[PDB]
Amino acid sequence: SMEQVAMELRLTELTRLLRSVLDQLQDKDPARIFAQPVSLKEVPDYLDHIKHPMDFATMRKRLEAQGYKNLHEFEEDFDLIIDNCMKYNARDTVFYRAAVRLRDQGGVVLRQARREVDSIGLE
Ligand SMILES: CNC(=O)c1cnc2ccccc2c1
Ligand code: NA
């Protein structure tokens, strides 16, 4: 149907927007602390602590499969990256402090993204 194609065009352009947001958020992680899943070889007990791991690479995989239906789903995954880190790592660590900075600096990007999604009506 024509309607289904229209919907797919919308999802595709949401995906385009979210890819830009993702790239912008990842730029705020030059240390690349959040680039890849926390290694169970480097951190054997991680999954005992964190029930839903997340990282930028995993987000990108879902993104490219057009697995984010709206900005809220994307934001949920971004929040997981931050929140997991602030629980697994203590306040005084380079890890925790990196999450705080990512959350603060990411907020600006997500604030405008929300306005753009609403504006262009991508969901
Ligand atoms: C977001 N990353 C982490 O939370 C983290 C924590 N500890 C680690 C220890 C050794 C190697 C990697 C680690 C990663
Ligand atoms: Na903690």
UniProtKB/Swiss-Prot annotation:
Domain (Bromo) ranges: 9-113
Cross-link annotation Glycyl lysine isopeptide (Lys-Gly) (interchain with G-Cter in SUMO2), location: K41
Subcellular location, record wording: Nucleus; Chromosome
Entry superkingdom: Eukaryota
Role description: Scaffold subunit of various histone acetyltransferase (HAT) complexes, such as the MOZ/MORF and HBO1 complexes, that acts as a regulator of hematopoiesis. Plays a key role in HBO1 complex by directing KAT7/HBO1 specificity towards histone H3 'Lys-14' acetylation (H3K14ac), thereby promoting erythroid differentiation.
Subunit-structure text: Component of some HBO1 complex composed of KAT7/HBO1, MEAF6, ING4 and BRD1/BRPF2. Component of the MOZ/MORF complex composed at least of ING5, KAT6A, KAT6B, MEAF6 and one of BRPF1, BRD1/BRPF2 and BRPF3. Interacts (via PHD-type zinc finger domain) with unmodified histone H3. Interacts (via PWWP domain) with dimethylated and trimethylated 'Lys-79' on histone H3.
Name listed for the protein in its UniProt record: Bromodomain-containing protein 1
Species assigned in the record: Homo sapiens
